[PDB]
């Protein structure tokens, strides 16, 4: 873990740094906080309470946030993390690297579902 974290600490684009590292075979960040949930939730991206469906897993919000995990500045103009204090739903085929998934996808605007992973706005 210390390798990729100290790696995203030596660059101006931490998001690109992490993604290029794991796209090149680097080990995803471990110890993301996976919750035990009923697969009953709405299935949205980010939620005050777990909202996993049968195809998702829920993670503690801070633990899947690169900027939280590596103790570096959050890019949000408001300075407030989008994940910390909340829960994040991850497609189950993507649990090998929750942080990589969150760095690579964005929740829709109208609906709060992952674009391409639940957003049916088209």
């Amino acid at each position: 873990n210390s390798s990729v974290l100290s790696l995203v600490n030596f660059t101006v684009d931490p998001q690109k740094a992490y993604l290029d590292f794991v796209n090149a075979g680097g080990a995803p960040l471990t110890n993301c906080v996976k919750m035990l949930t009923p697969k009953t939730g709405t299935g949205i991206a980010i939620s005050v309470k777990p909202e996993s469906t049968a195809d998702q897993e829920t993670y503690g919000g801070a633990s899947v946030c690169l900027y939280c995990r590596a103790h570096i500045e959050h890019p949000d103009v408001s300075g407030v993390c989008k994940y910390k204090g909340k829960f994040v739903q991850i497609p189950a085929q993507c649990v090998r690297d929750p942080v990589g998934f969150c760095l690579s996808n964005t929740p829709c605007n109208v609906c709060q579902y992952w674009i391409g992973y639940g957003c049916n706005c088209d």
């Binding site: 110890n31 993301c32 906080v33 996976k34 919750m35 035990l36 949930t37 009923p38 009953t40 005050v48 309470k49 777990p50 503690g60 919000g61 801070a62 633990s63 939280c68 995990r69 103790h71 910390k84 204090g85 909340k86 829960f87 649990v95």
Partner: protein, 294 residues
């Protein structure tokens, strides 16, 4: 066994009333471990089982619930229990957590440093402690009452805990305090709860349910720890997480417990009864201020 489907075991009055010497703790399955769901830290199950048991207790659950979680960090730099608390508690509850070492968590406020640096300005509603001092593993002589963070926690119960609030404080065979057992006598009810997910450890959560501020039961703390150990030595506990199969009722009931300000003279019997049933908290209703001091 039906007990495998419960979140764990609570010390029965059968052992609370014994009078024995403190003996060594010898668990038949000691340190044996149970696999968890893939990627799920064991502390997820531990905290969830603790929460499931507290779901059967008369917890006061107000709006803007004030919760403080000591020993929330880990050697992995993350905070699984805090996340369980976020999942368990009402959305408008305030979680403040703390640990000697740096970590990141889903709490509202996170304070690094010794718990003695945590200055609680107002009274809180629920204290969770999972603190354990590594030096406790150096077993040299007799197993005596311990100070460490228990001194701080004992003073907290006496000064910074709402009437009607509750505590859940981790103890083990060697990590325990006479004073803290005695203070269980100032709550409407108390027990020691051992999760099934970690039943092979002498760990238990010393629970004080509904703080009353006066002595309901006179407890000999040294003797009570000896009873706790006598119970652990007498009681087969099978490691299990079956209680986590059905999580449909996991969240803490939204009781809307009222918060009242009252002078000591006005407590009388109705209020005492309401506090003992988890139906009332007495404390300030200002803005919570929990910060780190120098």
């Amino acid at each position: 066994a039906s007990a495998d489907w419960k979140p764990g075991h609570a010390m029965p009055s059968l052992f609370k009333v014994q009078n024995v010497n403190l003996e060594r703790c010898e668990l038949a399955n000691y340190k044996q471990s149970i696999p968890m769901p893939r990627g799920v830290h064991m502390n997820i199950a531990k905290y969830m089982q603790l929460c499931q048991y507290l779901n059967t207790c008369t917890l006061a659950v107000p709006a803007n619930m004030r919760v403080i979680h000591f020993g929330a960090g880990s050697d992995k730099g993350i905070a699984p229990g805090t996340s369980v608390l976020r999942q368990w508690l009402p959305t408008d509850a305030i979680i403040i957590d703390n640990d000697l070492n740096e970590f990141v968590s889903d709490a509202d406020i996170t304070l690094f440093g010794d718990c003695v640096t945590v200055r609680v300005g107002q009274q809180v509603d629920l204290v969770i402690s999972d603190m354990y001092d590594p030096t406790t593993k150096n077993v040299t002589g007799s197993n005596e009452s311990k100070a460490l963070f228990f001194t701080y926690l004992c003073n907290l119960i006496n000064n910074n805990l709402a009437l009607g609030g509750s505590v859940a404080i981790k103890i083990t065979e060697h990590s325990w305090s006479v004073e803290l057992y005695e203070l269980m006598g100032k709550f409407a009810w108390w027990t020691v709860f051992c999760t099934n997910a970690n039943a092979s450890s002498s760990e238990g959560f010393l629970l004080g349910i509904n703080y009353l501020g006066t002595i309901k039961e006179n407890i000999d703390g040294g003797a009570m720890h000896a009873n706790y150990i006598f119970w652990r030595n007498s009681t087969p506990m099978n490691l299990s997480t079956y209680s986590l199969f059905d999580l449909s009722k996991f969240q803490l009931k939204l009781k809307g417990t009222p918060v009242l300000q009252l002078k000591e003279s006005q407590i009388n019997e109705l209020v005492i009864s309401l506090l003992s049933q988890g139906k009332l908290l007495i404390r300030d209703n200002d803005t919570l201020s929990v910060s780190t001091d120098v």
